[PDB]
PDB file of C-alpha atoms in Angstrom:
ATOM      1  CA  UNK A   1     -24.187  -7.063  30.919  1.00  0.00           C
ATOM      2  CA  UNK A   2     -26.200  -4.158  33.502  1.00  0.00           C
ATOM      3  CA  UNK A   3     -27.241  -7.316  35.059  1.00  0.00           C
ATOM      4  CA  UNK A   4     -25.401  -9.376  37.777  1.00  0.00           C
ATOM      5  CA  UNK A   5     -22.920  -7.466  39.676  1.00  0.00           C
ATOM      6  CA  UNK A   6     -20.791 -10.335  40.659  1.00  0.00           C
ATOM      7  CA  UNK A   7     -18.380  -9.955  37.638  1.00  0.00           C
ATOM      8  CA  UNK A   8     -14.634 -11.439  38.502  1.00  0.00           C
ATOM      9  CA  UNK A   9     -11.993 -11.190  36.457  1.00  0.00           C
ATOM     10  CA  UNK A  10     -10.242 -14.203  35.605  1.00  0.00           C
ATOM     11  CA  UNK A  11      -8.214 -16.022  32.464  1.00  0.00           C
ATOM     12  CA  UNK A  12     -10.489 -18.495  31.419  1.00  0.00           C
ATOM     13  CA  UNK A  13     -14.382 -18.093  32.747  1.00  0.00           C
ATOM     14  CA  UNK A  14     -17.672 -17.569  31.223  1.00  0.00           C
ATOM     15  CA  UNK A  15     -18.054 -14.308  33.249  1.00  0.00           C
ATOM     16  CA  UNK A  16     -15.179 -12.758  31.207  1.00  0.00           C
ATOM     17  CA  UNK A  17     -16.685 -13.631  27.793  1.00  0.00           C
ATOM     18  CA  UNK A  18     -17.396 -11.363  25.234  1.00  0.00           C
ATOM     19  CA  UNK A  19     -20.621 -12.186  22.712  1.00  0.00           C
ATOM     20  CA  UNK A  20     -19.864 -12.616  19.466  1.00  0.00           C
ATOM     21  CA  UNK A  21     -22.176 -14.209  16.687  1.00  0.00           C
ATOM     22  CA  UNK A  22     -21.882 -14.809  12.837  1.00  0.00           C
ATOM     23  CA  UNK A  23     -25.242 -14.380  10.715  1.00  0.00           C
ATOM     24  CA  UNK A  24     -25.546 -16.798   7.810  1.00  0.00           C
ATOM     25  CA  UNK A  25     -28.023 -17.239   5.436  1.00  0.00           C
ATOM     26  CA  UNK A  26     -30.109 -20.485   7.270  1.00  0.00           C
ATOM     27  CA  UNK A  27     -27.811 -20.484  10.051  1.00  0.00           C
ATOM     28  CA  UNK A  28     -26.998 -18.937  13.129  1.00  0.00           C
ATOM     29  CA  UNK A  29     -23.390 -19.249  14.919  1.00  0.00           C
ATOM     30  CA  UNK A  30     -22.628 -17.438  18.728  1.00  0.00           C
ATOM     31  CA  UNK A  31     -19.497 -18.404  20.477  1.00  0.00           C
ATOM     32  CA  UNK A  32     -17.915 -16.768  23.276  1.00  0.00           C
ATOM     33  CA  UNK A  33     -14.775 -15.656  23.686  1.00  0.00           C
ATOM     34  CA  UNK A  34     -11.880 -13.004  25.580  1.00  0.00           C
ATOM     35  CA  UNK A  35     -13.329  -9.923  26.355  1.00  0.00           C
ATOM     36  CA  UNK A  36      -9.388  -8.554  26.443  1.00  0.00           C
ATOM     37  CA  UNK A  37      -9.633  -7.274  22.763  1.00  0.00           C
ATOM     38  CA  UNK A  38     -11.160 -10.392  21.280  1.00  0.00           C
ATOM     39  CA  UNK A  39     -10.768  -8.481  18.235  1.00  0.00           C
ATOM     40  CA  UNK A  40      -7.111  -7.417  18.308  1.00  0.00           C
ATOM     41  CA  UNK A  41      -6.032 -11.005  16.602  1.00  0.00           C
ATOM     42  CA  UNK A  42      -7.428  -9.232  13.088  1.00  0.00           C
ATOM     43  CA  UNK A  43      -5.057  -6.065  13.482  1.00  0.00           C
ATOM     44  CA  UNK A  44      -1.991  -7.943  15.311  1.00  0.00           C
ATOM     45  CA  UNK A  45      -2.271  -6.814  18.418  1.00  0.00           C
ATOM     46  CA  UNK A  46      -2.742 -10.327  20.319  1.00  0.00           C
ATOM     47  CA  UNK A  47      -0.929 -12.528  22.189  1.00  0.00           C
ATOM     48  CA  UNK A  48      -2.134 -15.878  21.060  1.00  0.00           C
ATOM     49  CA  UNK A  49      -5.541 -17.656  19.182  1.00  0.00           C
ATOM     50  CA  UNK A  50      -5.444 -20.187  21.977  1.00  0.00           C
ATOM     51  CA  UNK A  51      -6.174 -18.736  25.209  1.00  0.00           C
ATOM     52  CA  UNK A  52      -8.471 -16.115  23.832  1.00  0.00           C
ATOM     53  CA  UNK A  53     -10.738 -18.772  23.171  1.00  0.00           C
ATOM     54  CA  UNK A  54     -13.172 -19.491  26.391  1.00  0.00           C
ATOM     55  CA  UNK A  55     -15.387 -21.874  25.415  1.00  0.00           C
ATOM     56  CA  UNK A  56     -15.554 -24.541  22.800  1.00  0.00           C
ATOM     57  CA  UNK A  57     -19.523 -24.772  22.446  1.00  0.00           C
ATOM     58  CA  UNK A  58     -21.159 -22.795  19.555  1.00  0.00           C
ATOM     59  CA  UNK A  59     -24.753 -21.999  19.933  1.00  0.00           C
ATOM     60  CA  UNK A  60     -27.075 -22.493  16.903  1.00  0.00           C
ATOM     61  CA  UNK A  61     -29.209 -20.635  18.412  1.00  0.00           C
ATOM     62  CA  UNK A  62     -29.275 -19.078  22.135  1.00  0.00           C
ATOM     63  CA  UNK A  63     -33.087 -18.453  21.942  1.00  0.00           C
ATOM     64  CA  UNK A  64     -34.234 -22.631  21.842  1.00  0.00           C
ATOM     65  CA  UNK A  65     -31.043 -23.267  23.424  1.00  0.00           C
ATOM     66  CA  UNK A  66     -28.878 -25.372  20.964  1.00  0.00           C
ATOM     67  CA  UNK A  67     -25.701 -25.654  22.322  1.00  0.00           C
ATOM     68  CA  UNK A  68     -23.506 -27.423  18.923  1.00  0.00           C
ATOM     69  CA  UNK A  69     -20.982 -30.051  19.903  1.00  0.00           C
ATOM     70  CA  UNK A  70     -18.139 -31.139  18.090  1.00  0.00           C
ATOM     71  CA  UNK A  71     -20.174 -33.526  15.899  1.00  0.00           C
ATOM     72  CA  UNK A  72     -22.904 -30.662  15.286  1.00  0.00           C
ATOM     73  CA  UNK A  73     -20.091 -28.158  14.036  1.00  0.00           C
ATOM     74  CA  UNK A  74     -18.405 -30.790  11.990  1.00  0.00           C
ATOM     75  CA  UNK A  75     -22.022 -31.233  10.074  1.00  0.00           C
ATOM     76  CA  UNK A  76     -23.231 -27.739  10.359  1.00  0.00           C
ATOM     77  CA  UNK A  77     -19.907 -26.086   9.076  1.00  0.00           C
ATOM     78  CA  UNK A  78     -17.878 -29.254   8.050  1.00  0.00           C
ATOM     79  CA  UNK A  79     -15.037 -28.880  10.103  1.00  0.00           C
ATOM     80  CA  UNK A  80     -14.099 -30.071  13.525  1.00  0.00           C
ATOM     81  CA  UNK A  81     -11.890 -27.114  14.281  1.00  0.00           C
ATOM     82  CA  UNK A  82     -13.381 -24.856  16.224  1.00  0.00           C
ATOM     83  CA  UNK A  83     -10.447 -22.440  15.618  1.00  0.00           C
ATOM     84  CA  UNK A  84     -11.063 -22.255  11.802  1.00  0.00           C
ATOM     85  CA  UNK A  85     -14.979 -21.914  12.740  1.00  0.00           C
ATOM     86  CA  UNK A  86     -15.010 -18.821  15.523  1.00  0.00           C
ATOM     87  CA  UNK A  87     -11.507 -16.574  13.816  1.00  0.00           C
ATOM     88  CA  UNK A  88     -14.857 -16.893  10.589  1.00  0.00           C
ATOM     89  CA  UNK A  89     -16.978 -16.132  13.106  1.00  0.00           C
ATOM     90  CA  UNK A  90     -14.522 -13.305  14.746  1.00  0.00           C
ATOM     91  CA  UNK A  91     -13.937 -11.373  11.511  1.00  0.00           C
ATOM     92  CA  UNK A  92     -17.509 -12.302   9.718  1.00  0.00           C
ATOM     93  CA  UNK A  93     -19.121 -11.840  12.677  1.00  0.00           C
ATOM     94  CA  UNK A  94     -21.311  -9.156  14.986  1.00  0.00           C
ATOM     95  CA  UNK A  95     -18.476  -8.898  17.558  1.00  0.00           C
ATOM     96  CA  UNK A  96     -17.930  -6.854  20.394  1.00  0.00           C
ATOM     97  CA  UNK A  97     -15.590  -3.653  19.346  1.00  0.00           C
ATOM     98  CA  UNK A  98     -15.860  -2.650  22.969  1.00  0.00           C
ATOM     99  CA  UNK A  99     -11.995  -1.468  24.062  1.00  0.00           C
ATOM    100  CA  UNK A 100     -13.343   0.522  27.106  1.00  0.00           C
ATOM    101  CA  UNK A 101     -16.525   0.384  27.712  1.00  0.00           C
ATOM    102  CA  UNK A 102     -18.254  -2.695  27.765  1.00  0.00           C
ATOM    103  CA  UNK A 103     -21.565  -1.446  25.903  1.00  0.00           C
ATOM    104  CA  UNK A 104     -22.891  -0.815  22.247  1.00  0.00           C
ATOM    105  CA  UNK A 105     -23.024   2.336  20.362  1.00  0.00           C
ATOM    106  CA  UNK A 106     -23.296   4.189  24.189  1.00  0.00           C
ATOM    107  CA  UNK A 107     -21.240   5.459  26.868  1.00  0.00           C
ATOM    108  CA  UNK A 108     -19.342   8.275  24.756  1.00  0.00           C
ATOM    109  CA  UNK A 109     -17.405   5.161  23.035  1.00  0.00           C
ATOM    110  CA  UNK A 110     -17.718   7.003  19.944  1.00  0.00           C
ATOM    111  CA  UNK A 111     -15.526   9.496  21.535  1.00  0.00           C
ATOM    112  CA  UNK A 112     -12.925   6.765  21.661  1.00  0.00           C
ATOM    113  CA  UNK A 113     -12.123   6.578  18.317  1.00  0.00           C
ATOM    114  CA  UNK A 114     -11.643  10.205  18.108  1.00  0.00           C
ATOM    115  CA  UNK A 115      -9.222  10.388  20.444  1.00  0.00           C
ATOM    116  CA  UNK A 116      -6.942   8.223  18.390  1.00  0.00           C
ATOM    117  CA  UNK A 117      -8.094   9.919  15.353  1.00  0.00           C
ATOM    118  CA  UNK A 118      -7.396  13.309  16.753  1.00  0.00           C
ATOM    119  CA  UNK A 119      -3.474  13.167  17.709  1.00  0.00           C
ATOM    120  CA  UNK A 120      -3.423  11.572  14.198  1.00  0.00           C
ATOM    121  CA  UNK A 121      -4.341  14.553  12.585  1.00  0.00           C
ATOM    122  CA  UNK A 122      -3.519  18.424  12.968  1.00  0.00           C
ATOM    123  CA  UNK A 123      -6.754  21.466  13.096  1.00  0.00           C
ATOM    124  CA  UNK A 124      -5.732  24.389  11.782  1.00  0.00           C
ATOM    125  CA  UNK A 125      -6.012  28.053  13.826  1.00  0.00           C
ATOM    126  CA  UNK A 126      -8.458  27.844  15.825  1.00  0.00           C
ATOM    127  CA  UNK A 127      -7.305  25.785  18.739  1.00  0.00           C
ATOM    128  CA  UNK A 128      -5.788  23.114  19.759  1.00  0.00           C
ATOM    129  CA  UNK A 129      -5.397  19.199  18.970  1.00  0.00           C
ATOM    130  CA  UNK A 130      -5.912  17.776  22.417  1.00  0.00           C
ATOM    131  CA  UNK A 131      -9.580  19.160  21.581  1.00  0.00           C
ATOM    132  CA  UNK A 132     -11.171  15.509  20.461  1.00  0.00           C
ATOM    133  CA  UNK A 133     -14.960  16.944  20.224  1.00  0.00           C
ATOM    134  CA  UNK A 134     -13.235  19.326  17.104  1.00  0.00           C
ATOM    135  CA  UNK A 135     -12.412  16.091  15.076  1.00  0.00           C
ATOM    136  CA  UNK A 136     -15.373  13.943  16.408  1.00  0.00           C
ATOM    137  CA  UNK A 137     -18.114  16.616  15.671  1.00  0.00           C
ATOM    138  CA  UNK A 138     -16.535  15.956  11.811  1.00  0.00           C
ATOM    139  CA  UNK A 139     -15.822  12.056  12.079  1.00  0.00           C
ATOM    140  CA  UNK A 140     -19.346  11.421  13.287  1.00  0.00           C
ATOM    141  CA  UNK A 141     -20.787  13.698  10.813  1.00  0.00           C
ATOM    142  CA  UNK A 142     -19.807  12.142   7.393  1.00  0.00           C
ATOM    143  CA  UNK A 143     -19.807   8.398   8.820  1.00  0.00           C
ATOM    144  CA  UNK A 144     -21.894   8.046  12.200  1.00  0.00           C
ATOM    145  CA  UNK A 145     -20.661   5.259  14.692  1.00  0.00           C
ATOM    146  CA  UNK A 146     -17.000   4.911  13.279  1.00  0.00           C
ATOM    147  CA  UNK A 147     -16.273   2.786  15.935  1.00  0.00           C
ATOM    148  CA  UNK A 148     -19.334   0.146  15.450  1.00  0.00           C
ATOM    149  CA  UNK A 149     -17.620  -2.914  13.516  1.00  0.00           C
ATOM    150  CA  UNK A 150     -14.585  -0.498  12.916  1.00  0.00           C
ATOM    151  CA  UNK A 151     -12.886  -2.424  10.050  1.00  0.00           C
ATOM    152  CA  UNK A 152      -8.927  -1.485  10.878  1.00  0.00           C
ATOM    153  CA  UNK A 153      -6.579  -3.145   8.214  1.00  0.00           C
ATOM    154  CA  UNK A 154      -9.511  -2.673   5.704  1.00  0.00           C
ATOM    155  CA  UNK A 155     -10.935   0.262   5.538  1.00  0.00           C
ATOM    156  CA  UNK A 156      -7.749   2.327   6.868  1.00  0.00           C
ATOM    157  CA  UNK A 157      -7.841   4.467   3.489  1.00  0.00           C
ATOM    158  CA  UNK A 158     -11.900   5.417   4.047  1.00  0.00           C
ATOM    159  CA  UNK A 159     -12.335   6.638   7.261  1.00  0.00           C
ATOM    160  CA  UNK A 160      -9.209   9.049   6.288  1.00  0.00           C
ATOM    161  CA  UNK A 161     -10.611  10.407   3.575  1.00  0.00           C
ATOM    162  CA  UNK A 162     -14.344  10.750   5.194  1.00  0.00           C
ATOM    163  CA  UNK A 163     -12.647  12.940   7.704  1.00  0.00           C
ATOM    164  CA  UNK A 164     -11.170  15.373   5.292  1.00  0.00           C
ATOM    165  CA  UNK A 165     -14.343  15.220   3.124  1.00  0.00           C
ATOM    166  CA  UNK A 166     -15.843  17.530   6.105  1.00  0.00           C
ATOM    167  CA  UNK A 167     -12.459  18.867   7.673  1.00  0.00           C
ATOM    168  CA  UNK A 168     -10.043  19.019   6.009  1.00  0.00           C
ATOM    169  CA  UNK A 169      -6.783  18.311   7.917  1.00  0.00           C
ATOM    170  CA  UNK A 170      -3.293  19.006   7.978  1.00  0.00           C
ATOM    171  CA  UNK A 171      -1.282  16.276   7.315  1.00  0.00           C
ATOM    172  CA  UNK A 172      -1.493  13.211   9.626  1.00  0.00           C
ATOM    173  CA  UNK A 173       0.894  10.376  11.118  1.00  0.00           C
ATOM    174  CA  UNK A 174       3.957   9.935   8.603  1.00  0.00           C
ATOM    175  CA  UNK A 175       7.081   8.103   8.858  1.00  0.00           C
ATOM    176  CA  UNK A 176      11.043   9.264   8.767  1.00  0.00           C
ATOM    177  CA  UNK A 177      13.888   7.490   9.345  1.00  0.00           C
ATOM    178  CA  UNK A 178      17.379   8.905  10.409  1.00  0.00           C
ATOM    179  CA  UNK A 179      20.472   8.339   8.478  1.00  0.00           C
ATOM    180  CA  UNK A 180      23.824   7.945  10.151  1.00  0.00           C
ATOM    181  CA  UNK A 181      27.565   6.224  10.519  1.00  0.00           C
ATOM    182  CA  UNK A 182      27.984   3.208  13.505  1.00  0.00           C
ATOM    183  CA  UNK A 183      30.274   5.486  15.392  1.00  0.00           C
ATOM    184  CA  UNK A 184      26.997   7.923  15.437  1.00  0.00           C
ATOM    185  CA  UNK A 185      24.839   5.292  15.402  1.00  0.00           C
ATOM    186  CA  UNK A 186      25.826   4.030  18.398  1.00  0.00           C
ATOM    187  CA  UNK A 187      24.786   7.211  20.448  1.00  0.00           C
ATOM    188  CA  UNK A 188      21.056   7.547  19.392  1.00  0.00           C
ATOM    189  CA  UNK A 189      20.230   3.629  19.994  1.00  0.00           C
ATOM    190  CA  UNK A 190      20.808   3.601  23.128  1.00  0.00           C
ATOM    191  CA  UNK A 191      18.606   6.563  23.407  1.00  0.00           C
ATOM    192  CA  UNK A 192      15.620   6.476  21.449  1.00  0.00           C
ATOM    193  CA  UNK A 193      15.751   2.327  21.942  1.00  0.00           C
ATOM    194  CA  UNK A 194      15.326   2.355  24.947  1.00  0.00           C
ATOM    195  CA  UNK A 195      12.031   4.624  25.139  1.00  0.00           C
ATOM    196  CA  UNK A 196      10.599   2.262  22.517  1.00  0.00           C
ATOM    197  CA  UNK A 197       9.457   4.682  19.644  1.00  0.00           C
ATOM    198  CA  UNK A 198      10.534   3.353  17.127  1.00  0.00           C
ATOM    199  CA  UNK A 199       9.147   1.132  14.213  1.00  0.00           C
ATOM    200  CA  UNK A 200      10.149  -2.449  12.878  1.00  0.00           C
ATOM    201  CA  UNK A 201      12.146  -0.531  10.503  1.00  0.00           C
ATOM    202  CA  UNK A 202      15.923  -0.136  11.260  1.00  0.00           C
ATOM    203  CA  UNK A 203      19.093  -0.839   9.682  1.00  0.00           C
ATOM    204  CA  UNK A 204      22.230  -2.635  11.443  1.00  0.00           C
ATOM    205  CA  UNK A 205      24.744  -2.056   8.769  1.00  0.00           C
ATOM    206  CA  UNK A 206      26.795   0.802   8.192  1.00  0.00           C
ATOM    207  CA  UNK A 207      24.708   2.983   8.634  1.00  0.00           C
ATOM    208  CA  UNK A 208      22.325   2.775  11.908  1.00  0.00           C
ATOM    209  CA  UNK A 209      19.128   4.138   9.976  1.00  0.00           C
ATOM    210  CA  UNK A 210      16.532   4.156  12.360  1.00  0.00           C
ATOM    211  CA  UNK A 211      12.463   4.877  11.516  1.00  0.00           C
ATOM    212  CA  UNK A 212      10.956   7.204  15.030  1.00  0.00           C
ATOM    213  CA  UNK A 213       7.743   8.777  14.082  1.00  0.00           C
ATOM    214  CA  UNK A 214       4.619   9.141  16.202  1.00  0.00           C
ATOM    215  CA  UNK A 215       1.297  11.150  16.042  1.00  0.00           C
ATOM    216  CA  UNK A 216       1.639  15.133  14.601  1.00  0.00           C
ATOM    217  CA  UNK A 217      -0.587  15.768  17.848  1.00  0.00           C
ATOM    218  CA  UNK A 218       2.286  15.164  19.873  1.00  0.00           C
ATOM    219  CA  UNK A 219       5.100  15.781  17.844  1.00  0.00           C
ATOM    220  CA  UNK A 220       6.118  18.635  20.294  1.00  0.00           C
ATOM    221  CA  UNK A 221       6.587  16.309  22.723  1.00  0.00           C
ATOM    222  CA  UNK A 222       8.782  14.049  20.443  1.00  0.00           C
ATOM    223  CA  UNK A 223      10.616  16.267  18.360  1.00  0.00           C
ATOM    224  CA  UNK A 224      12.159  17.832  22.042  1.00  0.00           C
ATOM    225  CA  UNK A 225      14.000  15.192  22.203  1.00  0.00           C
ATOM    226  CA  UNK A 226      14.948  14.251  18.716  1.00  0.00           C
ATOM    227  CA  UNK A 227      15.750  17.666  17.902  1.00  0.00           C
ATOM    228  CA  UNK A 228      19.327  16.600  19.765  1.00  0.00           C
ATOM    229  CA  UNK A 229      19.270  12.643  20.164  1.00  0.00           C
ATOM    230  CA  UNK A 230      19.703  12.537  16.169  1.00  0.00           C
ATOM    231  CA  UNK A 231      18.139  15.211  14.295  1.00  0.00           C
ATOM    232  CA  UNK A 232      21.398  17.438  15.898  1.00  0.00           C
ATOM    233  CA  UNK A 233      23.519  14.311  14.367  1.00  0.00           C
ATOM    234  CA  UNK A 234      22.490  12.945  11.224  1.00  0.00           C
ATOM    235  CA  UNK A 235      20.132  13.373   8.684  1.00  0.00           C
ATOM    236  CA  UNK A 236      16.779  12.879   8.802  1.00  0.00           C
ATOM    237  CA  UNK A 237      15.203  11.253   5.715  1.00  0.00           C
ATOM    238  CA  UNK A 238      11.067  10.444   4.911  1.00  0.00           C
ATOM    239  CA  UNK A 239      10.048   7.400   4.243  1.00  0.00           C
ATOM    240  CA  UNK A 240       7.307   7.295   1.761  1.00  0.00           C
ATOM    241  CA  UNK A 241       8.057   4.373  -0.026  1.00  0.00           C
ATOM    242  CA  UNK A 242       6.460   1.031   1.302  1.00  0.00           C
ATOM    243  CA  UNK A 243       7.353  -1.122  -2.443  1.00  0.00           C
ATOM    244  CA  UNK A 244      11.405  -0.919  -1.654  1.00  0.00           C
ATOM    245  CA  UNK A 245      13.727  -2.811   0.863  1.00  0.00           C
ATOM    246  CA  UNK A 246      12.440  -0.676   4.105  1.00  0.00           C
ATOM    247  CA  UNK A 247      15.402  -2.407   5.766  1.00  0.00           C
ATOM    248  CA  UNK A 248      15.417  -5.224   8.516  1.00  0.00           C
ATOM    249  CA  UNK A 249      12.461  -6.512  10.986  1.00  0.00           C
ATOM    250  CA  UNK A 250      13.815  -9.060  12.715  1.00  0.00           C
ATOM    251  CA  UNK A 251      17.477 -10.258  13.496  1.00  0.00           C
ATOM    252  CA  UNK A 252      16.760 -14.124  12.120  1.00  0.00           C
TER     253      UNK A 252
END
């Protein structure tokens, strides 16, 4: 990076690679892979663990210049699948959070994460929640660089509770689903469907219960809507239990 200029963007090349290493104890193991969210395949939010993968070659070490074969990874880590080898590597591994900007701990990126953070969470009197720097001058107070090796499905519960042990918020991002007959039912699906804010949460049965619920920081700007697509219709239950039968995910 902030070196060549000549920077295409393409599927497969090794000028759209992101650097990504694993540290072990008498080993060293840098691959390259996707820069379009290499990382996403540890939170769900990839396509595939095929095409993501650029290059083959591991480097023992990119200082001497040991580029590991297949033969080399097979003796170094014991298996000839280099799949098994870099998603270690991926999620073990000093890789690139970078969703924006293509840089370290720089470039306001820790303003990223607050953005996400802030329509997540509601700031009492005193102004209002489009204004990020309120939450981030808290988020990077407790735990500086929240968005260096940001561990997602891991340490969800932590980084909510570091914010509140500064500021302490009001409420955050819940869930409710919306209980109703077919012959309402089949009003608000073709409504709220449609605009895709819903969850995989719904019910096809006899009663068309339905789980729309996004950030508090816009809620305004969803509630408009439900107010009268199904709030002005059925009933609107919460769902805060995730250890019962939520309902149905998938059709098969």
């Amino acid at each position: 990076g902030h070196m060549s200029i000549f920077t295409p963007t393409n599927q497969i090349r090794l000028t759209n690679v992101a650097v990504v290493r694993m540290k072990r104890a008498g080993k060293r193991f840098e691959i390259a892979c996707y820069k379009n969210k290499v990382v996403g395949w540890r939170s769900g939010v990839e396509k595939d663990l095929d095409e993501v993968l650029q290059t083959h070659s591991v480097f023992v070490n990119v200082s001497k210049g040991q580029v590991a074969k297949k033969e080399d990874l097979i003796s170094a880590f014991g298996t000839d699948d280099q799949t098994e080898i870099c998603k270690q590597i991926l999620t073990k591994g000093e890789v690139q959070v970078s969703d924006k900007e293509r840089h370290t701990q720089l470039e306001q990126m820790f303003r990223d994460i607050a953005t996400i953070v802030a329509d997540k969470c509601v700031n009492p009197e005193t102004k209002r929640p489009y204004t990020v720097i309120l939450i981030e001058r808290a988020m990077k107070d407790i735990h500086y660089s929240v968005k260096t090796n940001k561990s997602t499905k891991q340490q969800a519960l932590e980084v909510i509770k570091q914010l509140k042990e500064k500021m302490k918020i009001e409420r955050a991002h819940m869930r409710l689903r919306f209980i109703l007959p077919v012959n309402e039912g089949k009003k608000l699906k073709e409504k709220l469907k449609p605009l895709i804010k819903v969850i995989e949460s719904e019910d096809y049965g006899q009663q068309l219960e339905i789980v729309c619920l996004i950030d508090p920081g816009c809620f305004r700007e969803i509630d408009e809507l439900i107010k009268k697509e199904t709030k002005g219709k059925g009933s609107l239950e919460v769902l805060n239990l995730k250890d019962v039968e939520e309902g149905d995910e998938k059709f098969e």
